[PDB]
């Protein structure tokens, strides 16, 4: 939009999917995931995989509104859903974590917002 607002169609459509989820299930979290996306580009997440390892125990659903950036240990059984991953990141998460999965498949994981932690 007028100042801040994705020009990328895939990103803008994901925000619209997010709004429907907020309403139909009545949880707050997805709408929070929309506001984080809504921020400008140099305000969206830049997440390191040794920053993932350091925060929040195994088997929790990490939602990242930016990019996961590899080089760094990750020995946690956490399952990462994210808007993008590095090539390098995808390997660390899929060998130790619950899995690497896309954020548009996050609907399929968790559409209701129990056990989720937002991380950036």
């Amino acid at each position: 939009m007028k100042r801040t607002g994705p020009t990328d169609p895939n990103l803008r459509r994901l925000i619209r999917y997010l709004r429907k989820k907020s309403n139909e299930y009545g949880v707050k979290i997805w709408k929070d995931v929309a506001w984080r996306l809504e921020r400008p580009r140099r305000q969206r997440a830049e997440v390191n995989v040794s920053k993932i390892n350091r925060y929040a125990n195994d088997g929790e659903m990490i939602v990242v509104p930016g990019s996961v950036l590899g080089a760094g240990k990750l020995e946690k059984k956490v399952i990462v859903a994210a808007w993008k991953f590095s090539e390098t990141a995808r390997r660390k998460i899929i060998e130790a974590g619950g899995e690497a999965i896309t954020i548009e498949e996050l609907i399929e994981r968790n559409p209701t917002g129990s056990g989720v932690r937002i991380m950036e």
Binding site: R13, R16, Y17, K20, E24, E104, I107, E108, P111
Partner: peptide
Amino acid sequence: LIRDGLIE
């Protein structure tokens, strides 16, 4: 398809 709400 996702936008319709067919799944889930």
